[PDB]
């Protein structure tokens, strides 16, 4: 199956986010860090290991997809590269983000940062850096992701996902 | 050098003992089996002839 | 003599100070009234020297030192690597009538007629255990007290444990002595070596599993692939059980299998490999591999048969 | 209503199973097979009890048990596991009862009549050989 | 209420499986408790009936559980069992022996072995009854100890096989076979080979050579 952006009608003051990654503990920590703080909207978080998802009908529409890449293992990079081929092009227009983990400890890194630099640049998507092991940085990353999700869902008048694509565009 | 000879000679003596035991058991059970079979055959034949 | 005193001093120095009173109480060589005279609040060296003075005042032989060494070794029993042996008997032999004195005499006489200078010390302890300490020697040298050999035997059982210290040159002799004294026919070495004696005891006697059956939260988070998680949890629980696992720390595999994957398609020779697994507590890290997502849900049989097959070293061919 | 009768039947069958528990050998159905509980008693004095785990799948195998190692269970398993499993259980009962009785006799001798005995009596783990000297007043 | 019915059915199936595996079907069981405290002493009286596939029984006993700080001694103070009045006198003898010895498990195991040997004896006799109906005369029936072989040509010549089941003092059960020949002296005066006095020992050697039914059928064929 292929995931599409606009299959189902939006809910009433509800935003949904999807997190794809191999390490479940980090995803769980990021999720309950996002849900720890309150906001004006109703947030829902979905967790997955890879794409495509198991078939279901009750699943609502997805507004943002975040791919978590762990620099300490090539398995996560291979999994993300495989999963990137199961989403349509129309979903890449400002609704996909990349989150790299483990850049702080250089000695443990097994993947060069320049490889994920091409990976992010090829698909025209923003790239973020964070160490999910530390709570102080994880809280800030969760707040930033919540703000980005609120922008993407259309809760901010005058700003859409396409404009956000131009806002975070890199010069080179 | 002679210590190895000690060890190896004890080895073959030990591994040949059970074979001798088993052969003795087989022989002294087979002898009585044959004797009993012959005696039973003789008795059966004699009784059959007496009845006939 | 002076060698006995030096050996006793070295043994005492090896003994820790906190548990020294227990070791001396268990030794039961010196009289009780001679123990409270020595003050244990002073420095360790002063106490050791005082004990050397007291034991030199009394007639002390090498048997007492050997018994003290045996007691210390059985109290520690984690400073050496242990190996196991398996013993087989003919089908035509009836159940043997085990006797302590006959076994001791036969074991002593075998070594006395094989070698010339050798020291043997015996200690019979509860749960039917026999500890044998052997100091090796030959005709042209005195027995060596620096490299002893420890043997643990269980009466009326086909198993015996040994300490791998110096027996490599006299292993067949020790095996012959064991198989002659206990009236057995064949002795073989099992591929099972470890540092924890209790783990070996539990594995060999397969009494590590004693689970017997008788009649006498953030709903906003949606976890997908939950069925896969429950399936892998069930598979792990069924394969590894629920009982506490025995403690092991090493595993070795040798592989002589062909490479099958365009790449080395024309090669007809095996790919020789040697693999070692090391961990402070094995059989528990492997249990957590599947939930962590590092390995597949069903593990390879080569890793889930360590306690069932009672082996530690593996060889695999094509 | 029907709940009372159902509870009465449940307690009756539970009592029946507890009654089977006293016959010496009991069995319980589990997923992998049947768990058998074996009991030992000598002259009416109940003693320790053991358990054995079995597997129903062919061929019959042994999962684990708590029987002492020096009891020769391997040969009797190899020669009666596949045929007449009840006879296997009864023979195992024979072995355990005899061994428990011998141990009980030895322990009663060691504990009760310690005055007549001079030194400790030599005993083997299987308790099939005794040797002791005694002086009677 | 479907779940409760399912549990009742599962328990019934398990009970039937255990009964057909062990071989003992029990009747209703009754329990009474008495507290005699001076360190605690409890007297428990149990009563239960049952049957083993062929034979019924009714037993009632009382035990004295002595609970202390470190020991829990249980001793069968009294036991009393009752049978049905069969013709097996050794059964009553063993019942008396078990009553005066005050033990339970050996009684059950011996009863199992006894009924097992009895069923083999009955099945062996009834099979040979129909295999050769013209040469077999089961005077007392398949549920007895006697077997009567006779030739219809002459009723004078016939012999009997006695199969007995004995219980030793320890509690084991073992069978025994013998033959008795009702032969007139006309055979003695006819044959001077004198092959009739050695019939018992020779027959017992024969049955220990190639089996039981093989010896029986060989005897039937020779007498034919």
mmCIF file with all atom_site columns, N, CA and C in Angstrom, chain B residues 3 6-12 14-15 17-18 21-22 25, chain C residues 91-93 113 115 137-139 172-173 176 179-180 184-185:
data_model
loop_
_atom_site.group_PDB
_atom_site.id
_atom_site.type_symbol
_atom_site.label_atom_id
_atom_site.label_alt_id
_atom_site.label_comp_id
_atom_site.label_asym_id
_atom_site.label_entity_id
_atom_site.label_seq_id
_atom_site.pdbx_PDB_ins_code
_atom_site.Cartn_x
_atom_site.Cartn_y
_atom_site.Cartn_z
_atom_site.occupancy
_atom_site.B_iso_or_equiv
_atom_site.pdbx_formal_charge
_atom_site.auth_seq_id
_atom_site.auth_comp_id
_atom_site.auth_asym_id
_atom_site.auth_atom_id
_atom_site.pdbx_PDB_model_num
ATOM 1  N N  . UNK B 1 3   ? 55.951 -44.006 31.452 1.00 0.00 ? 3   UNK B N  1
ATOM 2  C CA . UNK B 1 3   ? 54.653 -43.624 32.008 1.00 0.00 ? 3   UNK B CA 1
ATOM 3  C C  . UNK B 1 3   ? 53.539 -43.771 30.972 1.00 0.00 ? 3   UNK B C  1
ATOM 4  N N  . UNK B 1 6   ? 52.633 -47.388 30.756 1.00 0.00 ? 6   UNK B N  1
ATOM 5  C CA . UNK B 1 6   ? 51.705 -47.641 31.861 1.00 0.00 ? 6   UNK B CA 1
ATOM 6  C C  . UNK B 1 6   ? 50.275 -47.315 31.456 1.00 0.00 ? 6   UNK B C  1
ATOM 7  N N  . UNK B 1 7   ? 50.059 -46.059 31.060 1.00 0.00 ? 7   UNK B N  1
ATOM 8  C CA . UNK B 1 7   ? 48.705 -45.567 30.822 1.00 0.00 ? 7   UNK B CA 1
ATOM 9  C C  . UNK B 1 7   ? 48.035 -46.369 29.715 1.00 0.00 ? 7   UNK B C  1
ATOM 10 N N  . UNK B 1 8   ? 48.745 -46.574 28.604 1.00 0.00 ? 8   UNK B N  1
ATOM 11 C CA . UNK B 1 8   ? 48.117 -47.235 27.468 1.00 0.00 ? 8   UNK B CA 1
ATOM 12 C C  . UNK B 1 8   ? 47.804 -48.697 27.764 1.00 0.00 ? 8   UNK B C  1
ATOM 13 N N  . UNK B 1 9   ? 48.706 -49.413 28.451 1.00 0.00 ? 9   UNK B N  1
ATOM 14 C CA . UNK B 1 9   ? 48.432 -50.810 28.778 1.00 0.00 ? 9   UNK B CA 1
ATOM 15 C C  . UNK B 1 9   ? 47.203 -50.913 29.670 1.00 0.00 ? 9   UNK B C  1
ATOM 16 N N  . UNK B 1 10  ? 47.112 -50.041 30.682 1.00 0.00 ? 10  UNK B N  1
ATOM 17 C CA . UNK B 1 10  ? 45.906 -50.026 31.502 1.00 0.00 ? 10  UNK B CA 1
ATOM 18 C C  . UNK B 1 10  ? 44.679 -49.756 30.644 1.00 0.00 ? 10  UNK B C  1
ATOM 19 N N  . UNK B 1 11  ? 44.834 -48.910 29.619 1.00 0.00 ? 11  UNK B N  1
ATOM 20 C CA . UNK B 1 11  ? 43.715 -48.616 28.730 1.00 0.00 ? 11  UNK B CA 1
ATOM 21 C C  . UNK B 1 11  ? 43.195 -49.872 28.039 1.00 0.00 ? 11  UNK B C  1
ATOM 22 N N  . UNK B 1 12  ? 44.072 -50.651 27.388 1.00 0.00 ? 12  UNK B N  1
ATOM 23 C CA . UNK B 1 12  ? 43.516 -51.797 26.657 1.00 0.00 ? 12  UNK B CA 1
ATOM 24 C C  . UNK B 1 12  ? 42.990 -52.852 27.623 1.00 0.00 ? 12  UNK B C  1
ATOM 25 N N  . UNK B 1 14  ? 41.494 -52.342 30.468 1.00 0.00 ? 14  UNK B N  1
ATOM 26 C CA . UNK B 1 14  ? 40.182 -51.883 30.895 1.00 0.00 ? 14  UNK B CA 1
ATOM 27 C C  . UNK B 1 14  ? 39.141 -52.027 29.794 1.00 0.00 ? 14  UNK B C  1
ATOM 28 N N  . UNK B 1 15  ? 39.496 -51.713 28.543 1.00 0.00 ? 15  UNK B N  1
ATOM 29 C CA . UNK B 1 15  ? 38.465 -51.770 27.510 1.00 0.00 ? 15  UNK B CA 1
ATOM 30 C C  . UNK B 1 15  ? 38.217 -53.191 27.015 1.00 0.00 ? 15  UNK B C  1
ATOM 31 N N  . UNK B 1 17  ? 38.146 -55.849 29.341 1.00 0.00 ? 17  UNK B N  1
ATOM 32 C CA . UNK B 1 17  ? 37.404 -56.558 30.389 1.00 0.00 ? 17  UNK B CA 1
ATOM 33 C C  . UNK B 1 17  ? 35.907 -56.734 30.094 1.00 0.00 ? 17  UNK B C  1
ATOM 34 N N  . UNK B 1 18  ? 35.144 -55.689 29.740 1.00 0.00 ? 18  UNK B N  1
ATOM 35 C CA . UNK B 1 18  ? 33.697 -55.891 29.549 1.00 0.00 ? 18  UNK B CA 1
ATOM 36 C C  . UNK B 1 18  ? 33.358 -56.845 28.420 1.00 0.00 ? 18  UNK B C  1
ATOM 37 N N  . UNK B 1 21  ? 33.436 -60.229 29.863 1.00 0.00 ? 21  UNK B N  1
ATOM 38 C CA . UNK B 1 21  ? 32.259 -60.464 30.697 1.00 0.00 ? 21  UNK B CA 1
ATOM 39 C C  . UNK B 1 21  ? 31.031 -60.782 29.846 1.00 0.00 ? 21  UNK B C  1
ATOM 40 N N  . UNK B 1 22  ? 30.808 -59.990 28.793 1.00 0.00 ? 22  UNK B N  1
ATOM 41 C CA . UNK B 1 22  ? 29.645 -60.191 27.935 1.00 0.00 ? 22  UNK B CA 1
ATOM 42 C C  . UNK B 1 22  ? 29.698 -61.542 27.232 1.00 0.00 ? 22  UNK B C  1
ATOM 43 N N  . UNK B 1 25  ? 28.730 -64.265 29.690 1.00 0.00 ? 25  UNK B N  1
ATOM 44 C CA . UNK B 1 25  ? 27.287 -64.291 29.923 1.00 0.00 ? 25  UNK B CA 1
ATOM 45 C C  . UNK B 1 25  ? 26.550 -64.929 28.751 1.00 0.00 ? 25  UNK B C  1
ATOM 46 N N  . UNK C 2 91  ? 26.851 -52.805 30.568 1.00 0.00 ? 91  UNK C N  1
ATOM 47 C CA . UNK C 2 91  ? 25.465 -53.167 30.904 1.00 0.00 ? 91  UNK C CA 1
ATOM 48 C C  . UNK C 2 91  ? 25.364 -54.404 31.779 1.00 0.00 ? 91  UNK C C  1
ATOM 49 N N  . UNK C 2 92  ? 26.377 -55.264 31.764 1.00 0.00 ? 92  UNK C N  1
ATOM 50 C CA . UNK C 2 92  ? 26.375 -56.485 32.540 1.00 0.00 ? 92  UNK C CA 1
ATOM 51 C C  . UNK C 2 92  ? 26.818 -56.344 33.979 1.00 0.00 ? 92  UNK C C  1
ATOM 52 N N  . UNK C 2 93  ? 27.202 -55.146 34.407 1.00 0.00 ? 93  UNK C N  1
ATOM 53 C CA . UNK C 2 93  ? 27.639 -54.905 35.773 1.00 0.00 ? 93  UNK C CA 1
ATOM 54 C C  . UNK C 2 93  ? 26.454 -54.488 36.635 1.00 0.00 ? 93  UNK C C  1
ATOM 55 N N  . UNK C 2 113 ? 51.498 -46.431 43.032 1.00 0.00 ? 113 UNK C N  1
ATOM 56 C CA . UNK C 2 113 ? 52.176 -47.371 42.151 1.00 0.00 ? 113 UNK C CA 1
ATOM 57 C C  . UNK C 2 113 ? 52.507 -46.764 40.796 1.00 0.00 ? 113 UNK C C  1
ATOM 58 N N  . UNK C 2 115 ? 53.211 -43.130 40.186 1.00 0.00 ? 115 UNK C N  1
ATOM 59 C CA . UNK C 2 115 ? 54.308 -42.224 40.484 1.00 0.00 ? 115 UNK C CA 1
ATOM 60 C C  . UNK C 2 115 ? 55.024 -42.696 41.748 1.00 0.00 ? 115 UNK C C  1
ATOM 61 N N  . UNK C 2 137 ? 54.204 -34.895 41.585 1.00 0.00 ? 137 UNK C N  1
ATOM 62 C CA . UNK C 2 137 ? 55.639 -35.072 41.686 1.00 0.00 ? 137 UNK C CA 1
ATOM 63 C C  . UNK C 2 137 ? 56.032 -36.329 40.946 1.00 0.00 ? 137 UNK C C  1
ATOM 64 N N  . UNK C 2 138 ? 57.337 -36.575 40.901 1.00 0.00 ? 138 UNK C N  1
ATOM 65 C CA . UNK C 2 138 ? 57.864 -37.751 40.223 1.00 0.00 ? 138 UNK C CA 1
ATOM 66 C C  . UNK C 2 138 ? 58.966 -38.352 41.086 1.00 0.00 ? 138 UNK C C  1
ATOM 67 N N  . UNK C 2 139 ? 59.686 -39.320 40.517 1.00 0.00 ? 139 UNK C N  1
ATOM 68 C CA . UNK C 2 139 ? 60.750 -39.996 41.247 1.00 0.00 ? 139 UNK C CA 1
ATOM 69 C C  . UNK C 2 139 ? 61.915 -39.072 41.568 1.00 0.00 ? 139 UNK C C  1
ATOM 70 N N  . UNK C 2 172 ? 45.487 -38.340 31.503 1.00 0.00 ? 172 UNK C N  1
ATOM 71 C CA . UNK C 2 172 ? 45.115 -39.761 31.389 1.00 0.00 ? 172 UNK C CA 1
ATOM 72 C C  . UNK C 2 172 ? 45.332 -40.539 32.674 1.00 0.00 ? 172 UNK C C  1
ATOM 73 N N  . UNK C 2 173 ? 46.383 -40.216 33.430 1.00 0.00 ? 173 UNK C N  1
ATOM 74 C CA . UNK C 2 173 ? 46.613 -40.894 34.701 1.00 0.00 ? 173 UNK C CA 1
ATOM 75 C C  . UNK C 2 173 ? 45.489 -40.609 35.689 1.00 0.00 ? 173 UNK C C  1
ATOM 76 N N  . UNK C 2 176 ? 42.384 -42.521 34.582 1.00 0.00 ? 176 UNK C N  1
ATOM 77 C CA . UNK C 2 176 ? 42.498 -43.941 34.891 1.00 0.00 ? 176 UNK C CA 1
ATOM 78 C C  . UNK C 2 176 ? 42.303 -44.196 36.379 1.00 0.00 ? 176 UNK C C  1
ATOM 79 N N  . UNK C 2 179 ? 38.547 -43.845 37.118 1.00 0.00 ? 179 UNK C N  1
ATOM 80 C CA . UNK C 2 179 ? 37.731 -44.930 36.589 1.00 0.00 ? 179 UNK C CA 1
ATOM 81 C C  . UNK C 2 179 ? 38.064 -46.277 37.216 1.00 0.00 ? 179 UNK C C  1
ATOM 82 N N  . UNK C 2 180 ? 39.230 -46.412 37.842 1.00 0.00 ? 180 UNK C N  1
ATOM 83 C CA . UNK C 2 180 ? 39.565 -47.654 38.530 1.00 0.00 ? 180 UNK C CA 1
ATOM 84 C C  . UNK C 2 180 ? 39.055 -47.647 39.965 1.00 0.00 ? 180 UNK C C  1
ATOM 85 N N  . UNK C 2 184 ? 34.451 -48.237 37.310 1.00 0.00 ? 184 UNK C N  1
ATOM 86 C CA . UNK C 2 184 ? 33.802 -47.903 36.051 1.00 0.00 ? 184 UNK C CA 1
ATOM 87 C C  . UNK C 2 184 ? 34.666 -48.413 34.904 1.00 0.00 ? 184 UNK C C  1
ATOM 88 N N  . UNK C 2 185 ? 34.149 -48.292 33.683 1.00 0.00 ? 185 UNK C N  1
ATOM 89 C CA . UNK C 2 185 ? 34.787 -48.883 32.514 1.00 0.00 ? 185 UNK C CA 1
ATOM 90 C C  . UNK C 2 185 ? 35.329 -47.857 31.529 1.00 0.00 ? 185 UNK C C  1
#
